[PDB]
Amino acid sequence: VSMRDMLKAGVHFGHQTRYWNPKMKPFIFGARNKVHIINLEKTVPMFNEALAELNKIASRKGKILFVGTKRAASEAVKDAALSCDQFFVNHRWLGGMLTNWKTVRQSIKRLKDLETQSQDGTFEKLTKKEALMRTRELEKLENSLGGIKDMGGLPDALFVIDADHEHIAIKEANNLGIPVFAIVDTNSDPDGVDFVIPGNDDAIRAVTLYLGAVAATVREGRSQ
RNA sequence: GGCUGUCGUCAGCUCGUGUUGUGAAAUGUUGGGUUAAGUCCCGCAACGAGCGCAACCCUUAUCCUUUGUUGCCAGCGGUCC
């Protein structure tokens, strides 16, 4: 991935100096106007070393789960995983989506059966008042569980945009040994993720970049 | 044992799995709104479920169909009215 490209995106940008996390000292060039700057020279080799790892999982038809619920990087997230044939989460992660599979699995069945009882027309020939609680009931399920609806079991790797914001998923993923690939940032803990990609996690330009790239490689890897 | 009063027809009382705590425990069941109501909605390390709440039951208020004696008399005709 082009080291010039990122100057363009804004990846070098971090967070205000005061909100920094001192575990990210390694991945810092310095500060300008009391605002931190990611040493991109550390980003790019780290990043390419996570693309590679992602390839060889995507090789064996494992499932890259993508998570990103920021009211920036949601439509960004959906686009990418769909542009790959994988799974995604872009509205609140709901605690135990991984550790409590048994149960959360048993709320997918419902969403399946509410999809049927919609196209099949049952959500029409009924109480009319009961096309409220038989639709809102679906609408929400397909806002939350939708992304992972046909996922049948636990992922083979989470790919996570913001570590800070999505700390619950990462802990759950550590809980299950599921390897994690995060876009950590100057203000975030390095310490829970396995393939740390430094750089900005809060920009429409920056996110699409890493997504596009991880999208490219899982498709370039889902072939051989 | 069975049956019954009572707080109280008050809106509460809990469980599975997950998570937190060395542990009793906690979370859910808190928060913003709303409601007669843990009523409903939005949020949220919770995700769900159950007993309650409400609804299904009887009665009362209006209308329609069918049936018309031992009940009824609007229009007719008669009358010991």
Ligand SMILES: [Mg+2]
């Ligand atoms: Mg423990």
Ligand SMILES: [Mg+2]
């Ligand atoms: Mg209580």
Ligand SMILES: [Mg+2]
């Ligand atoms: Mg409690």
Ligand SMILES: [Mg+2]
């Ligand atoms: Mg409490």
Ligand SMILES: [Mg+2]
């Ligand atoms: Mg409340």
Ligand SMILES: [Mg+2]
């Ligand atoms: Mg209830």
